[PDB]
Amino acid sequence: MVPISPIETVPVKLKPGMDGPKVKQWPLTEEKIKALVEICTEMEKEGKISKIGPENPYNTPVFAIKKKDSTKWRKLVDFRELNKRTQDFWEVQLGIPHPAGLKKKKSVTVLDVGDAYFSVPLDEDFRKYTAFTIPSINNETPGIRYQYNVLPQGWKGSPAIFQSSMTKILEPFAAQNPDIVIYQYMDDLYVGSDLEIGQHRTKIEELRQHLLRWGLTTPDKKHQKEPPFLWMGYELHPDKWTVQPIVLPEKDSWTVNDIQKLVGKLNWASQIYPGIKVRQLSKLLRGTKALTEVIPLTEEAELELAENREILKEPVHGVYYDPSKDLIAEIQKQGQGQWTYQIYQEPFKNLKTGKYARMRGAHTNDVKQLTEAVQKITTESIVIWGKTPKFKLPIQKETWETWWTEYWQATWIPEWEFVNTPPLVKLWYQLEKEPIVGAETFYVDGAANRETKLGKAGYVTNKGRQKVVPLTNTTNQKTELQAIYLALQDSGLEVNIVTDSQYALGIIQAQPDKSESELVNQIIEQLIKKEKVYLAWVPAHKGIGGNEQVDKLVSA
Amino acid sequence: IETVPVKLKPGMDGPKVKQWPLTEEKIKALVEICTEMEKEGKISKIGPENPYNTPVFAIKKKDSTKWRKLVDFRELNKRTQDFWEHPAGLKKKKSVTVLDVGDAYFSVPLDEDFRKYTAFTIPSINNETPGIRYQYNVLPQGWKGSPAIFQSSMTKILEPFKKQNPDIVIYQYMDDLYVGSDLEIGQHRTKIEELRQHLLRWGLTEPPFLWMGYELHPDKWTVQPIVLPEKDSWTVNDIQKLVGKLNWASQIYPGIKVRQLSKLLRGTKALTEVIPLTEEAELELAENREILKEPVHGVYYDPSKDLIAEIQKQGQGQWTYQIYQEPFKNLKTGKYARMRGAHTNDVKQLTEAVQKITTESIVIWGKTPKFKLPIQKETWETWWTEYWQATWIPEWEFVNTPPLVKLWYQ
Numbered sequence: 001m002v003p004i005s006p007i008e009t010v011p012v013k014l015k016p017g018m019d020g021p022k023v024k025q026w027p028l029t030e031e032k033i034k035a036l037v038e039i040c041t042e043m044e045k046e047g048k049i050s051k052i053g054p055e056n057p058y059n060t061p062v063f064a065i066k067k068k069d070s071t072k073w074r075k076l077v078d079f080r081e082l083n084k085r086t087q088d089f090w091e092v093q094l095g096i097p098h099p100a101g102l103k104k105k106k107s108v109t110v111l112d113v114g115d116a117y118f119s120v121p122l123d124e125d126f127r128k129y130t131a132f133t134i135p136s137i138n139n140e141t142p143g144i145r146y147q148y149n150v151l152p153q154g155w156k157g158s159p160a161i162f163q164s165s166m167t168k169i170l171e172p173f174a175a176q177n178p179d180i181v182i183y184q185y186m187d188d189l190y191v192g193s194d195l196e197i198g199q200h201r202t203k204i205e206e207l208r209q210h211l212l213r214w215g216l217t218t219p220d221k222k223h224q225k226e227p228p229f230l231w232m233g234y235e236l237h238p239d240k241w242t243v244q245p246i247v248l249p250e251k252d253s254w255t256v257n258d259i260q261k262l263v264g265k266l267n268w269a270s271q272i273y274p275g276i277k278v279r280q281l282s283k284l285l286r287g288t289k290a291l292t293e294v295i296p297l298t299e300e301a302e303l304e305l306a307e308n309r310e311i312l313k314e315p316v317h318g319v320y321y322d323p324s325k326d327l328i329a330e331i332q333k334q335g336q337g338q339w340t341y342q343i344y345q346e347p348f349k350n351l352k353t354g355k356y357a358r359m360r361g362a363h364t365n366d367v368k369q370l371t372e373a374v375q376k377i378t379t380e381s382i383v384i385w386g387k388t389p390k391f392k393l394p395i396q397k398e399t400w401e402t403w404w405t406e407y408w409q410a411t412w413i414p415e416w417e418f419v420n421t422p423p424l425v426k427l428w429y430q431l432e433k434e435p436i437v438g439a440e441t442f443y444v445d446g447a448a449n450r451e452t453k454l455g456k457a458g459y460v461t462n463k464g465r466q467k468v469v470p471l472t473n474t475t476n477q478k479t480e481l482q483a484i485y486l487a488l489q490d491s492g493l494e495v496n497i498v499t500d501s502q503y504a505l506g507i508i509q510a511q512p513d514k515s516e517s518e519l520v521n522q523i524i525e526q527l528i529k530k531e532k533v534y535l536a537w538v539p540a541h542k543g544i545g546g547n548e549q550v551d552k553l554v555s556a
Numbered sequence: 557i558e559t560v561p562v563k564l565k566p567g568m569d570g571p572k573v574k575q576w577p578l579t580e581e582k583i584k585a586l587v588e589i590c591t592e593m594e595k596e597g598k599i600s601k602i603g604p605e606n607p608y609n610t611p612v613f614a615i616k617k618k619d620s621t622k623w624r625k626l627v628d629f630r631e632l633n634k635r636t637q638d639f640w641e642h643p644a645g646l647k648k649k650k651s652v653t654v655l656d657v658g659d660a661y662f663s664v665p666l667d668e669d670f671r672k673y674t675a676f677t678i679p680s681i682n683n684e685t686p687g688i689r690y691q692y693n694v695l696p697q698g699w700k701g702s703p704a705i706f707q708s709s710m711t712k713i714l715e716p717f718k719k720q721n722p723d724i725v726i727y728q729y730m731d732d733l734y735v736g737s738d739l740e741i742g743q744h745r746t747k748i749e750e751l752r753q754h755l756l757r758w759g760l761t762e763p764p765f766l767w768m769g770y771e772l773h774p775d776k777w778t779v780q781p782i783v784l785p786e787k788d789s790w791t792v793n794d795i796q797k798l799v800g801k802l803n804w805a806s807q808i809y810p811g812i813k814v815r816q817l818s819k820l821l822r823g824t825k826a827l828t829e830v831i832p833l834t835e836e837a838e839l840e841l842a843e844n845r846e847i848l849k850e851p852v853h854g855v856y857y858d859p860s861k862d863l864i865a866e867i868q869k870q871g872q873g874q875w876t877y878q879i880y881q882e883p884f885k886n887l888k889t890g891k892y893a894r895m896r897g898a899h900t901n902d903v904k905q906l907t908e909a910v911q912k913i914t915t916e917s918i919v920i921w922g923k924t925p926k927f928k929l930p931i932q933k934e935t936w937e938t939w940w941t942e943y944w945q946a947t948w949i950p951e952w953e954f955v956n957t958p959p960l961v962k963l964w965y966q
């Protein structure tokens with residue numbers, strides 16, 4: 001007999017203060033008991049479980065399930081109690097590769113190593129917490145007591161302890177065979193290389209040999225699987241990748257759940273199918289939580305869907321990452337706060353695609369949104385490729401420069417170039433830095449009665465132009481805005497406006513190009529038509545005439 | 557050689573902070589550094605039974621090209637017990653050099669039961685391999701317990717130089733020694749050079765960033781005066797801005813009046829029209845100028861309260877900042893235009909500003925302020941690590957609405 005190397009156990013503990021499980025063993029049928037005793041006798045002989053004395057006071061329920069269209073049974077140990085009481089672990093498998101980050105391989109082979117799970121021993125002092133009882137026939141003798149000797153299926157720490165053990169074994173092989181690459185995922189090892197299929201199949205055999213040092217059995221060269229590989233919603237080939245088929249159902253009407261599903265598929269699809277939109281569809285999921293309610297599709301949602309189907313008519317693939325080439329990310333504005341992007345290295349061969357959507361808020365502008373999309377792509381790119389892509393953006397260099405140098409916040413986008421593909425992101429108005437000589441000065445004010453919602457908005461100018469408008473169902477804030485709007489409406493192409501509204505300043509200094517408030521939107525449309533606007537703030541209630549004069553009028 | 561017992565605060569578990577994405581080049585450097593640290597026994601690989609985590613990244617100190625591992629221990633610092641088991645002369649000193657003495661910490665073993673809490677992960681690109689997991693065996697750089705557990709050794713190492721030089725103020729914050737003199741830069745750099753011999757002498761009883769010396773001096777005003785324009789002709793707009801500034805200042809200085817100037821603003825004049833100051837207006841302005849020359853009333857530092865720092869972007873590479881504990885009771889204000897190799901990068905400038913203000917803060921009060929940064933969270937958190945050169949890290953929050961007050965500091 002050739003000695004095999006032992007697999008070092010990982011020390012486990014229960015959560016502090018907590019103790020192991022003490023849960024009643026269910027009444028079984030005589031038939032199920034016979035089946036379990038058979039299974040357990042085999043498992044005990046293999047070394048997977050062992051019979052314990054009366055000492056141990058811990059118990060976990062065990063069940064038997066009938067395999068569909070068969071006459072044999074299956075052993076299921078319900079560890080839910082023990083899991084609540086077992087310590088937390090480092091759960092590596094949370095992060096998985098994105099296919100766009102993989103490198104192209106000539107060959108890729110999978111080795112099933114599920115059989116190593118049961119060759120991975122459990123920490124001796126923790127075993128007792130895993131005790132279970134096979135009830136006896138007619139309950140006339142003591143139940144047969146067992147504890148596990150190896151990592152149990154469904155126990156909290158099995159996934160993490162298995163992977164760490166596997167990684168530890170593979171390290172010297174991987175490090176000494178740098179012309180191959182191994183990726184671990186649950187039960188599988190994916191092994192890729194750019195070698196001749198001769199050399200490649202040999203490295204695979206050597207890996208099987210290496211795994212045997214620890215006595216880990218593996219499948220023959222007629223490995224159960226070869227590419228293409230179905231993995232995590234993707235289809236992987238050695239030279240290209242895509243997502244698994246997206247099929248948009250034909251429907252005569254859509255309910256809440258169907259839309260969410262529809263959203264999901266579109267979202268999944270959008271990482272490789274360019275242009276996908278989900279805005280109108282996601283607008284039908286607002287607030288309510290009754291999945292049964294049928295929702296009528298607006299003419300908007302109907303057209304977005306038709307635009308979606310056309311994009312999904314034929315298959316699209318991504319290519320893999322070539323470390324020897326630049327990464328390029330290109331962005332387009334789609335409208336309604338929606339942004340789409342592609343990441344590629346060569347023209348017309350995307351590595352991946354994606355989309356970005358406007359953050360919820362009252363006021364916004366395109367430049368700010370473009371900037372958020374850039375940051376999102378940047379961070380995603382760091383995850384996938386370890387580097388920032390060169391950007392191709394639909395905003396003129398001169399526009400960006402005006403924006404960042406005058407914006408009140410710090411802002412930055414990394415190395416980029418203008419791409420002239422409409423619609424272009426632009427600045428829609430720019431306020432003056434100094435008062436305009438020869439332009440009329442409008443002193444504006446508005447006020448409202450908190451109790452009746454009655455208000456007034458208006459202005460007085462240096463030319464004696466004046467206006468006061470009575471308003472109903474309004475607030476101080478809305479009247480302050482209305483007053484600015486009236487000054488904009490009634491002035492020429494150049495105008496100085498004096499306000500005491502900190503609120504109105506706060507909004508305008510934020511430079512929105514679009515608002516949830518139709519009044520802010522009307523102000524923006526006026527700002528667009530002007531040639532020069534200087535907006536001046538003064539403190540309220542101060543005897544600053546003009547302002548004082550106009551406050552008297554609207555406070556009446 | 558005998559470790560100092562450390563525990564967390566009652567009812568608090570260790571840090572479980574997600575590792576953030578790193579660029580390929582930072583990963584490559586962390587791998588090289590950790591491989592060597594492991595060989596030197598400073599850290600050890602850990603298994604899945606350790607669920608804790610603190611983010612790690614890599615930086616380059618100011619005027620150096622070599623990567624330095626930096627652990628973001630902010631969460632552990634919060635959750636680590638306080639160790640009670642500030643040199644006012646420092647700020648007043650003519651000059652201060654800042655020394656990275658952090659490498660010294662690596663010679664003191666860390667309490668066995670505490671090591672699990674210093675867990676960190678080196679991530680892989682695209683999650684293609686499992687994160688490499690380590691924990692510290694020794695005092696880690698950036699942990700608050702590290703200076704506190706090394707303070708005993710440190711005094712013994714500095715007993716000669718201090719007895720020899722009773723004039724030099726010496727202060728330690730985290731991985732930095734602050735060495736303040738009144739001497740001349742030649743004596744200074746030499747006396748600094750002298751101090752570098754004590755840690756080489758103790759060192760062999762080799763440090764990567766011990767050689768560097770960062771030079772700084774205090775400035776004239778702690779809180780910059782509020783100044784008002786001096787003009788021979790005032791337009792309506794000039795007077796409106798003046799009354800606005802003074803109304804703001806009256807929140808800080810109680811005697812400030814604007815009635816006589818506001819009265820000039822009586823009426824509906826063109827903004828560019830020149831208004832002659834009345835005699836009542838000139839006196840009031842004069843009275844306010846005088847008031848603004850005096851110090852603020854009732855301003856005192858309190859160690860039991862947080863320091864708050866506000867920064868404003870003034871444009872053309874200029875930045876203003878104020879440090880306070882209570883609103884309108886500024887403890888220190890300042891203005892910066894001096895940012896290097898950042899002329900087309902706002903975010904680099906702001907990151908440098910944050911580092912400068914934090915340094916000043918450590919010198920004056922021996923603690924760091926919480927920043928209110930004029931930047932969107934997502935932009936800041938994408939980029940700040942690219943420009944960070946300090947071994948500590950302050951707290952920050954984000955300002956999303958433009959302050960009206962930016963002018964008043966301009």
Ligand SMILES: COc1ccnc(Nc2ccc(C#N)c(OCC=C(C)C)c2)n1
Pocket residue numbers: 097101102103104105108181182183190191192227228229231236237238239320684
């Ligand atoms: C196996 O580990 C790695 C690491 C880096 N790049 C690749 N490339 C690569 C290329 C093509 C296929 C295919 N088919 C493939 O499949 C295995 C990887 C998975 C399941 C994420 C991987 N594989």
